[PDB]
């Protein structure tokens with residue numbers, strides 16, 4: 323059923339990700355790879371995208387990103403109403419998660 | 424700290440969109456988002472406070488094709 | 489109308505993306521290339537993603553040409569023509 | 583030198599767009615582009631080689647309100 | 648005796664002082680004289696170095712709250728060497744920068760001093776501390792040397 | 808002061824990287840004359856060029872250099888006037904942009920950093936002038952006390 327307003331939110335999210343990804347890689351390549359969980363090869367691609375390249379990729383009408391959590395058992399315990407270190411806890415797991423090449 | 428603020432904003436942006444997608448049409452959103460049903464069910468049942476606390480990290484919460 | 493608004497909206501965004509990239513990289517150097525005041529350049533660095541999209545699809549050309557003298561422009565586009573244009577634009581006010 | 587390419591490409595995009603606008607409807611393009619008739623006439627009569635050599639600068643060829 | 652070599656070492660020395668490195672960490676990772684660092688530290692920060700000796704104790708890094716910060720910090724350091732292709736003190740610093748980055752969100756005080764962070768790396772480099780994978784969540788935390796796995800549960804999955 | 812020494816040595820490397828001559832370093836840094844030579848010998852393969860500071864205005868009115876100098880200065884002028892950065896910092900940031908512009912034309916670097924730094928000190932001492940072109944309107948360099956109302960830039964009429 324998705325179209326009209328929904329497609330507007332999809333294209334906006336894709337752009338915001340790419341803008342952050344380039345801002346992260348440009349400031350520091352290695353630090354960016356850590357946050358995005360992405361290989362050195364891809365980071366070179368994201369930083370090297372020009373303004374016109376971004377417009378094309380941004381408004382693809384498709385969900386460019388995929389979720390970084392695939393274990394429902396982990397997600398429920400991570401986001402549960404008890405120690406509140408859930409924010410720190412998620413960082414340790416996502417750090418060991420492999421990059422994408 | 425501006426870098427952190429944008430990271431926190433993008434995470435919440437993704438979570439809000441995935442949540443709306445799953446809530447409107449789960450069978451199709453799981454396909455569009457490439458996510459399992461059990462995760463799709465978790466996303467739908469997340470409160471606004473949970474989405475903030477989940478998004479408030481120094482790491483980007485979604486990868487890329 | 490119709491298709492033209494896609495090219496207008498695309499160009500408006502593409503300019504804004506360049507302005508932020510230049511200002512974030514170096515404020516003073518960006519002001520020089522964009523010929524824009526310190527106040528405006530500072531604004532561009534702080535603009536968020538959604539804020540840019542709104543201005544992009546305004547159906548109006550947000551940017552304006554930096555040449556208003558046809559006599560200079562015509563002579564400009566006829567081998568140092570590239571160098572000459574830089575000296576003129578540098579003195580142009582913000 | 584990558585910064586030069588983004589500057590050259592945006593410039594060429596503006597010139598290509600302004601040329602396409604003026605060529606379709608000069609009276610109507612002058613409104614949206616905020617340009618005089620004399621400049622619009624020059625923009626229409628520019629070749630692709632002229633537009634490139636004009637756009638190949640280290641400065642952005644259009645400002646902003 | 649290279650002038651450039653001296654410029655880089657002094658450059659590195661200021662970086663560590665900004666992160667709160669103790670005197671000993673400076674002597675280890677720079678070729679600068681012990682006396683020159685004191686003038687540098689006195690120039691950077693108001694007073695002279697704390698004169699306290701290096702901790703080198705593993706009991707601290709197994710307390711639950713420090714274990715969290717260290718197991719978190721190391722996961723960044725591990726990534727820096729494994730996939731970041733950056734090793735040495737540079738890798739140690741870049742990980743601490745992210746650790747500090749993550750601290751701001753929680754709002755708590757920085758529990759891992761840069762010296763303790765640098766101490767942790769020398770502990771792992773010297774095979775005195777080990778990484779155990781959590782049976783429940785799967786995240787790898789720091790534990791004592793030669794402690795057995797297959798029965799491990801992390802501090803986050805099961806606090807005291 | 809050790810910090811005072813660290814920044815000056817770091818600045819010296821920047822200038823050596825830009826091709827500054829020995830004297831330019833001595834003027835804008837607190838390092839010893841001999842230390843610069845050891846530093847210059849470490850960065851670049853050879854010792855300093857041993858050539859003395861140029862300081863002559865006949866060069867900057869020559870057909871090709873007048874172009875490059877008038878372009879470089881118009882960038883420099885923006886750095887001080889509206890860029891809110893003055894001093895040796897202003898000189899370097901302008902030269903970086905000048906070099907940037909060379910890449911497009913593809914020609915050889917006609918204005919060395921030393922001549923660029925010399926040009927700025929010439930203006931600081933009111934020995935060189937900026938005349939606005941009657942035809943194009945861009946401001947180029949001319950001799951001190953040169954008359955206007957008959958000025959035409961090198962580009963409008965070679």
Ligand SMILES: [Zn+2]
Pocket residue numbers: 781782783784785786800801802803804805
């Ligand atoms: Zn666990």
Ligand SMILES: [Zn+2]
Pocket residue numbers: 940941942943944945959960961962963
């Ligand atoms: Zn002229």
